[PDB]
Amino acid sequence: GSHMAPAEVSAVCEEKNFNVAHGLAWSYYIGYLKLILPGLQARIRMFNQLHNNMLSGAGSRRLYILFPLDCGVPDDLSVADPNIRFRDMLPQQNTDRAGVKNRAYSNSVYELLENGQPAGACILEYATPLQTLFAMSQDGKAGFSREDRLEQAKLFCRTLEEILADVPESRNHCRLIVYQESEEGNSFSLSQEVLRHIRQ
Amino acid sequence: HSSGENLYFQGSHMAPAEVSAVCEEKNFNVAHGLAWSYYIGYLKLILPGLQARIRMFNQLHNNMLSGAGSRRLYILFPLDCGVPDDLSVADPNIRFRDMLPQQNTDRAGVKNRAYSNSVYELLENGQPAGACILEYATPLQTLFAMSQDGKAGFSREDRLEQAKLFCRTLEEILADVPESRNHCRLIVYQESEEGNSFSLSQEVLRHIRQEEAAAA
């Protein structure tokens, strides 16, 4: 029994709503991922030269991005799991390519353990814009709920997946690792989650 | 085979608030996201303790930032969205002086950070008329880059609308920050609609002068 308000169809407006995810995704792609992707393989070759070819398989030559739907990203950005071991940062290039020419982005290579045994290696990181969503949910003058936060997180992920899907196979090297720890949780293992992605 | 859905104006997979046409509907989701990202991701990080860095600079540089008008972080918002890499190229009247120094924090809410913020002198008639901390609003470049992808469309007209919305959204967010903690000031302009003779430095100077007047 709730009527809509009257509306003049020629007036210019936008629906009010909290759908920031699209901006986050585009910013993240245009302003980070797109910038680093063209030099990733070169950087990997440099890394391999110094690391006994630790990243040799195709599965090891990808950029794995952690996407905790609860938006819990540690402040120090550490990936900290007993079975994930930091090995070294990915070295910078001497490049004239846009953005990277003036910026050395920090990326790290980790070794994954299973059953005490080395099971893999990869370049791993958190999707930093998830911090924004979390901060928004806190900063309550923002009026963004925990419920909104999850919704946006899922949307950011889906939107980013769509964008990435259109990347040519030649640079199709980002992989999203999406999980919601609060769900399906008990025995949850990050290392196991990453390994499944590497393995596939 | 791509869709080709407009990757820019993607949906949110949720039911709309209203079930009829309500307007000549616009989607500004990108602009809104850019604004939140910039505020949370940058401004919230930079603003706390800024006054301390400013005091330090004045100690180091003969009170170059004297006056309330100089104690603000001035951010440039060119509505045309072209963001230059050098301010002196952009206006020769804008002269780089030095970087804001980093403080060793004694405050619980201010971390030790490393942002490069730059202080410039502004010239009128070859003489310095003022000094301030000046930089561009970074997300504007993202909109510009989005407009370039011709396939993508995202027109010059469309770009301008998003740019304006980005400013509005940022302004709405800032409006809820107490004056005691909001040390940034937004300078919004569209060069392409200004005079043949637009001076960036004059535009900044006006703002600085306003700030000084407002501060009593």
Side-chain angles (χ1 to χ4, degrees), chain A, chain B residues 2-216:
Chain A
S2 203
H3 299 109
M4 85 180 172
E8 155 71 46
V9 301
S10 78
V12 171
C13 89
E14 58 162 345
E15 182 190 288
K16 283 180 188 183
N17 63 46
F18 243 124
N19 299 320
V20 298
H22 304 272
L24 298 184
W26 283 100
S27 181
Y28 189 57
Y29 175 75
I30 293 286
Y32 176 66
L33 299 179
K34 190 179 209 282
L35 310 184
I36 59 159
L37 273 170
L40 190 65
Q41 298 301 316
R43 296 171 70 198
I44 290 164
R45 292 189 288 275
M46 292 185 42
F47 184 92
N48 276 338
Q49 178 187 138
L50 264 77
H51 298 85
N52 286 317
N53 294 331
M54 177 186 313
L55 305 178
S56 48
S60 288
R61 294 188 200 184
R62 304 303 183 248
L63 170 59
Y64 294 96
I65 303 161
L66 292 169
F67 267 92
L69 294 173
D70 295 322
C71 296
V73 175
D75 314 284
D76 60 0
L77 289 190
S78 75
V79 189
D81 184 299
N83 291 326
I84 307 181
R85 303 236 180 297
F86 172 91
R87 289 288 161 215
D88 248 320
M89 316 179 70
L90 209 55
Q92 82 188 305
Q93 310 183 264
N94 181 23
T95 311
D96 292 318
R97 198 167 79 253
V100 288
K101 180 182 182 179
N102 301 114
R103 310 176 198 154
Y105 289 105
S106 296
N107 317 92
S108 305
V109 179
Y110 304 82
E111 162 166 68
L112 302 155
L113 308 180
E114 173 155 46
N115 290 325
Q117 284 181 69
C122 69
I123 308 169
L124 197 58
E125 62 193 51
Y126 287 101
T128 54
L130 289 179
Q131 290 174 310
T132 279
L133 294 177
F134 179 80
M136 276 167 75
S137 74
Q138 306 309 90
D139 166 338
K141 81 187 150 185
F144 194 65
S145 91
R146 287 197 87 113
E147 312 80 51
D148 291 318
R149 182 184 76 207
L150 181 58
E151 193 163 11
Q152 294 304 311
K154 294 174 172 176
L155 204 72
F156 170 39
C157 176
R158 192 177 347 186
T159 296
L160 198 45
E161 289 167 10
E162 270 153 32
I163 298 181
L164 291 175
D166 266 20
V167 178
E169 175 65 40
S170 59
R171 292 302 156 209
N172 169 22
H173 304 141
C174 312
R175 300 297 183 257
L176 310 188
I177 300 177
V178 189
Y179 54 100
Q180 194 179 350
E181 223 191 311
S182 75
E183 289 312 283
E184 279 308 354
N186 46 334
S187 78
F188 177 73
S189 171
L190 198 47
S191 59
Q192 283 302 304
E193 192 77 7
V194 181
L195 278 163
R196 169 189 325 153
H197 283 263
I198 298 177
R199 284 173 185 154
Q200 298 173 329
Chain B
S2 296
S3 18
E5 177 172 10
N6 181 356
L7 289 189
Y8 301 157
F9 281 170
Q10 280 185 70
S12 308
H13 306 99
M14 61 186 72
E18 307 186 78
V19 292
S20 79
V22 299
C23 77
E24 199 167 291
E25 194 177 347
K26 300 314 173 87
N27 177 326
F28 292 129
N29 291 338
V30 179
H32 288 96
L34 293 185
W36 284 96
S37 161
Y38 187 66
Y39 175 70
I40 304 288
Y42 180 61
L43 294 178
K44 281 196 85 178
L45 307 186
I46 205 82
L47 295 173
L50 190 68
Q51 293 306 327
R53 301 179 57 200
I54 294 178
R55 291 198 302 279
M56 216 175 279
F57 190 92
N58 285 326
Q59 170 180 34
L60 297 170
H61 300 279
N62 193 38
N63 278 335
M64 177 183 301
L65 294 177
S66 65
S70 294
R71 296 192 290 265
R72 307 296 181 254
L73 172 57
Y74 289 101
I75 312 178
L76 300 166
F77 290 74
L79 290 176
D80 294 315
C81 298
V83 175
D85 51 63
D86 192 314
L87 274 160
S88 306
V89 180
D91 185 328
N93 290 320
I94 301 171
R95 291 264 148 275
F96 174 75
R97 295 280 177 264
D98 220 323
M99 256 52 188
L100 268 190
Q102 308 302 333
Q103 178 179 30
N104 214 271
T105 69
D106 50 6
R107 300 175 54 199
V110 184
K111 322 305 160 175
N112 293 335
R113 305 215 181 256
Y115 292 104
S116 302
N117 310 97
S118 305
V119 176
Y120 299 82
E121 204 145 48
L122 305 172
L123 308 180
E124 319 173 292
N125 300 116
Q127 335 167 258
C132 66
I133 312 164
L134 202 51
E135 55 190 62
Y136 287 88
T138 308
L140 287 178
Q141 195 53 40
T142 297
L143 287 179
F144 182 84
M146 284 166 84
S147 72
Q148 314 292 101
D149 201 39
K151 43 198 173 125
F154 219 60
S155 91
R156 286 247 166 179
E157 309 96 349
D158 293 300
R159 179 185 73 211
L160 179 57
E161 274 206 298
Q162 299 273 335
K164 288 173 177 185
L165 222 301
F166 170 64
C167 297
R168 195 191 74 201
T169 305
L170 195 49
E171 295 172 358
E172 291 160 4
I173 297 170
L174 292 171
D176 282 330
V177 180
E179 170 188 345
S180 69
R181 307 200 293 267
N182 179 8
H183 313 303
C184 81
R185 306 287 194 272
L186 316 184
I187 309 181
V188 176
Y189 61 95
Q190 196 183 341
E191 186 165 8
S192 74
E193 307 282 301
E194 278 288 10
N196 348 325
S197 316
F198 171 67
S199 151
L200 186 56
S201 59
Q202 283 303 113
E203 192 78 9
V204 184
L205 273 166
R206 183 183 187 187
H207 277 96
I208 296 178
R209 289 158 168 161
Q210 283 178 345
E211 290 294 312
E212 194 82 41

